[PDB]
Amino acid sequence: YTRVVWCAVGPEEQKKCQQWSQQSGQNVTCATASTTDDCIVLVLKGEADALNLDGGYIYTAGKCGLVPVLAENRKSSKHSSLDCVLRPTEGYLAVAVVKKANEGLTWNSLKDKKSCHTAVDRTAGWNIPMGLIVNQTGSCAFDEFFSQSCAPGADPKSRLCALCAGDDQGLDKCVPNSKEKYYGYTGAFRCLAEDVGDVAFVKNDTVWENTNGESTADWAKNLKREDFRLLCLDGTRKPVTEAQSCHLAVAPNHAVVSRSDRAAHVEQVLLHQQALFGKNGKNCPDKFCLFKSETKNLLFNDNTECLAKLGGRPTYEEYLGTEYVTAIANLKKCSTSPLLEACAFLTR
Amino acid sequence: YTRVVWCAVGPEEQKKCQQWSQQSGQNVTCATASTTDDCIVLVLKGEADALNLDGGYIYTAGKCGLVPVLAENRKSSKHSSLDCVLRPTEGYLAVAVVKKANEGLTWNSLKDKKSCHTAVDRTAGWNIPMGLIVNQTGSCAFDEFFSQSCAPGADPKSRLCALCAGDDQGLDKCVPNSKEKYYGYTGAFRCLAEDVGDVAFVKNDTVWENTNGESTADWAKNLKREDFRLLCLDGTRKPVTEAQSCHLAVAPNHAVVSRSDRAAHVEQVLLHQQALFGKNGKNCPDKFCLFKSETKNLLFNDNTECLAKLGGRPTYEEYLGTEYVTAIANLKKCSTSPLLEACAFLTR
Ligand SMILES: *[C@@H]1O[C@H](CO)[C@@H](O[C@@H]2O[C@H](CO)[C@@H](O[C@@H]3O[C@H](CO)[C@@H](O)[C@H](O)[C@@H]3O)[C@H](O)[C@H]2NC(C)=O)[C@H](O)[C@H]1NC(C)=O
Ligand SMILES: *[C@@H]1O[C@H](CO)[C@@H](O[C@@H]2O[C@H](CO)[C@@H](O[C@@H]3O[C@H](CO)[C@@H](O)[C@H](O)[C@@H]3O)[C@H](O)[C@H]2NC(C)=O)[C@H](O)[C@H]1NC(C)=O
Ligand SMILES: *[C@@H]1O[C@H](CO)[C@@H](O[C@@H]2O[C@H](CO)[C@@H](O[C@@H]3O[C@H](CO)[C@@H](O)[C@H](O)[C@@H]3O)[C@H](O)[C@H]2NC(C)=O)[C@H](O)[C@H]1NC(C)=O
Ligand SMILES: *[C@@H]1O[C@H](CO)[C@@H](O)[C@H](O)[C@H]1NC(C)=O
Ligand SMILES: *[C@@H]1O[C@H](CO)[C@@H](O)[C@H](O)[C@H]1NC(C)=O
Ligand SMILES: [Fe+3]
Ligand SMILES: [Fe+3]
Numbered sequence: 001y002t003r004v005v006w007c008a009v010g011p012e013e014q015k016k017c018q019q020w021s022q023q024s025g026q027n028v029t030c031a032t033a034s035t036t037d038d039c040i041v042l043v044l045k046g047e048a049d050a051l052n053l054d055g056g057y058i059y060t061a062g063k064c065g066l067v068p069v070l071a072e073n074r075k076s077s078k079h080s081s082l083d084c085v086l087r088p089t090e091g092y093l094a095v096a097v098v099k100k101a102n103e104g105l106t107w108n109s110l111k112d113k114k115s116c117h118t119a120v121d122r123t124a125g126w127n128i129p130m131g132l133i134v135n136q137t138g139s140c141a142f143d144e145f146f147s148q149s150c151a152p153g154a155d156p157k158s159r160l161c162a163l164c165a166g167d168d169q170g171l172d173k174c175v176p177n178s179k180e181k182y183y184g185y186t187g188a189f190r191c192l193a194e195d196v197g198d199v200a201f202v203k204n205d206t207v208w209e210n211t212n213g214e215s216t217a218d219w220a221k222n223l224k225r226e227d228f229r230l231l232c233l234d235g236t237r238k239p240v241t242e243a244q245s246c247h248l249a250v251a252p253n254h255a256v257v258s259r260s261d262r263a264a265h266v267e268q269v270l271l272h273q274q275a276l277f278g279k280n281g282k283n284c285p286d287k288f289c290l291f292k293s294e295t296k297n298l299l300f301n302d303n304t305e306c307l308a309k310l311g312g313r314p315t316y317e318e319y320l321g322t323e324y325v326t327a328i329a330n331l332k333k334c335s336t337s338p339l340l341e342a343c344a345f346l347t348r
Numbered sequence: 349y350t351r352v353v354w355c356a357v358g359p360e361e362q363k364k365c366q367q368w369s370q371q372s373g374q375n376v377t378c379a380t381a382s383t384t385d386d387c388i389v390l391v392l393k394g395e396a397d398a399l400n401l402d403g404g405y406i407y408t409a410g411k412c413g414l415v416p417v418l419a420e421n422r423k424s425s426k427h428s429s430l431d432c433v434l435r436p437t438e439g440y441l442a443v444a445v446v447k448k449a450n451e452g453l454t455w456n457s458l459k460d461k462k463s464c465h466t467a468v469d470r471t472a473g474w475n476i477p478m479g480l481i482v483n484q485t486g487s488c489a490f491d492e493f494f495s496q497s498c499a500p501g502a503d504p505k506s507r508l509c510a511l512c513a514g515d516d517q518g519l520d521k522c523v524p525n526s527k528e529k530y531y532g533y534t535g536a537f538r539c540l541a542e543d544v545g546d547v548a549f550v551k552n553d554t555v556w557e558n559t560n561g562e563s564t565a566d567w568a569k570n571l572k573r574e575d576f577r578l579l580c581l582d583g584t585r586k587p588v589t590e591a592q593s594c595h596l597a598v599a600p601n602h603a604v605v606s607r608s609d610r611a612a613h614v615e616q617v618l619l620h621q622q623a624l625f626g627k628n629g630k631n632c633p634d635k636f637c638l639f640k641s642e643t644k645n646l647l648f649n650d651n652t653e654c655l656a657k658l659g660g661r662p663t664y665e666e667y668l669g670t671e672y673v674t675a676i677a678n679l680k681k682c683s684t685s686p687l688l689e690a691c692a693f694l695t696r
Contacts, residue, residue, distance in 0.1 A: 001488075001681070001682065001683075001684060002681040003488050003681040003682055005487075005488065017486065018485070018486030019486075020486075021483070021486035021487070022483055022484075022486065025674065025677075025678045025681075026482065026483065026488060026678045026679070026681045026682065027681065029486060029487055029488045029682075030486040030487055031487070
């Protein structure tokens with residue numbers, strides 16, 4: 001079985017993956033599920049092989065035995081010309097973000113406001129913010145800390161899904177895939193933009209990429225960096241350029257995961273795949289660009305140069321950073337989920 | 349070692365083979381196995397010299413070091429000035445056949461239907477439709493695509509063999525030799541004919557040959573060429589006279605393969621043999637007919653006019669054509685053959 005079956009979360013991702021299968025002559029094939037958690041289960045069953053994952057999902061899969069194959073990697077300023085696949089990863093910034101126009105809203109007045117989150121269990125969208133809010137307030141009731149949210153993946157009869165828009169017909173509110181208008185990085189930021197929420201937790205890179213003519217997408221052509229601000233943990237606010245000084249935390253980059261018995265096959269298949277279709281591969285754009293989704297972030301984030309190598313053969317823990325595994329761990333004392341419970345024994 | 353050991357797949361191909369041998373004066377003798385894959389093995393062991401094979405099987409043979417020697421040739425219309433043996437080959441049209449009565453069945457509503465196949469690994473029966481399907485669908489899961497099938501050679505427990513009737517007894521259900529009621533071109537079309545299946549993947553030439561009194565077999569004589577249609581890629585349904593505009597692809601002709609050292613000897617031996625027992629041969633039908641098997645396509649297809657020579661010495665790759673060879677490799681990234689796996693290092 002040479003083919004690497006890839007896991008597409010949601011129908012929009014499934015289409016780009018169907019495309020990739022066709023271009024790759026079945027070097028890659030598609031399986032899908034509605035959610036990432038579901039996909040992780042296919043990867044476990046052996047029904048799929050691999051998929052690229054936010055660091056928080058990496059911890060879920062990590063727990064269930066899956067391991068990290070190659071990290072997503074983006075442009076760089078520091079050391080900005082060693083080869084992409086061997087150049088170390090620099091992480092990204094998880095930020096709290098607001099309309100500038102609104103005032104009196106700051107980290108310390110967040111309680112009882114309205115939130116937009118990438119989706120539940122994700123790193124910047126969720127794990128970091130809710131992480132801190134737990135440590136600070138000192139209670140496990142983050143489900144009630146904000147007045148309402150969009151938090152795809154949460155309980156959809158609950159308040160954390162109260163603000164989610166669903167798709168075009170409004171079907172499937174709160175399903176944590178790209179058919180939910182406010183899903184993921186761009187979803188969240190848009191939930192901010194349309195004033196459905198007060199704060200939105202995202203990465204620095206997400207505001208720059210959807211303001212000031214960078215997206216030519218109806219919801220975001222006219223958006224202006226000026227109209228937004230970043231809450232720091234100071235109590236303070238700064239514009240988006242000071243993100244380095246105004247960020248909640250540093251996050252580990254998305255990364256591909258698979259089963260260990262499938263890691264090397266997958267890593268190799270992918271390295272060739274990116275050479276074919278990656279940022280500067282033979283066939284991109286003449287044929288297929290693996291890293292472009294028109295700002296919809298499918299399979300991969302659109303600002304990925306290449307998938308890069310990892311020091312040794314790490315585990316979720318080496319890969320994520322021991323500092324983060326604890327932040328996630330401690331947040332997770334305040335809530336259970338099917339997959340961590342079902343897999344808890346593997347890692348005891 | 350002058351005798352040519354001929355590989356006969358199955359007992360019926362066996363009886364014919366020995367009659368040939370008795371006439372041959374032992375210039376030709378027979379081995380047998382249950383399948384075409386086993387027969388190749390025999391050749392690899394050198395317990396047999398050669399046999400005649402569908403292109404798909406030629407791929408397998410080729411991967412195992414074996415080479416093509418001469419190609420089946422059948423009546424043409426154009427180019428009819430040369431001798432059959434020196435007249436270049438055309439190659440067959442591989443096609444999808446449904447009953448006309450079953451309406452709303454098109455290339456695009458095949459999923460979950462019941463299919464008939466010549467055999468796993470064959471060209472029209474398998475490699476073509478199953479390659480296209482796999483490719484269009486982006487999924488290597490062909491084993492779950494038809495609700496049921498008769499794909500002789502597949503795993504007999506599985507649903508690709510659900511519809512296979514075996515011999516008169518009901519024994520050897522799904523073995524890919526002629527004993528299986530639904531084996532080969534003839535059997536796949538019959539499968540459709542007796543409404544065991546909805547679709548059937550054969551070649552244009554099979555349909556003609558078994559409708560409107562073409563075959564005086566009980567199951568075929570009453571068959572009526574109108575009652576049938578062809579599926580085209582566009583999505584439409586032409587009648588069987590539009591094979592030219594409603595075919596899936598163009599198949600290379602079957603050819604004889606042999607171990608490489610033995611090619612010329614087999615070539616010489618066979619050229620003479622046909623002169624004797626071929627179409628116009630001093631001894632057909634007085635003593636023996638090499639290309640006539642009573643509508644069973646034993647050893648060779650019953651429509652074979654002679655065995656032609658081939659421009660130069662070709663690789664199996666050159667014979668099959670770079671494009672078909674790619675289609676196959678790509679489809680085979682979803683399976684494993686123990687045979688191919690073996691050949692991958694066991695061959696000079
Ligand atoms: C599908 O997968 C295979 C990966 O197995 C790709 O085929 C392989 O591609 C390399 C090209 O990168 C082939 O040739 C190479 O040539 C250079 C010399 O110019 C040499 O440095 C290398 O050692 C190698 O020989 C390689 O043979 C080939 N392997 C096979 C089995 O075909 C293919 O590109 C992938 N196709 C798609 C569409 O992704
Ligand atoms: C927050 O995210 C934004 C966007 O991801 C970051 O801005 C980007 O910064 C890089 C360099 O740091 C820019 O690339 C540069 O391009 C010029 C040529 O135009 C070149 O001379 C430099 O050597 C470098 O390659 C990139 O264009 C820029 N993108 C945009 C749309 O502004 C920003 O750095 C991030 N902020 C923090 C604190 O990390
Ligand atoms: C699809 O397959 C059928 C059967 O294999 C093809 O029909 C066959 O066509 C050839 C000629 O093109 C026929 O031979 C002709 O016979 C007459 C005398 O009967 C002669 O005057 C011509 O010069 C020529 O030799 C053959 O009889 C015929 N067989 C049957 C049963 O109809 C058809 O050509 C194929 N279609 C496509 C698009 O390839
Ligand atoms: C078998 O051997 C040779 C071919 O060189 C020939 O003299 C003899 O006639 C052949 N016999 C038959 C029946 O093919
Ligand atoms: C299947 O592969 C072929 C190339 O072999 C490609 O042209 C085609 O796009 C693929 N199928 C579809 C429906 O595009
Ligand atoms: Fe993230
Ligand atoms: Fe064939």
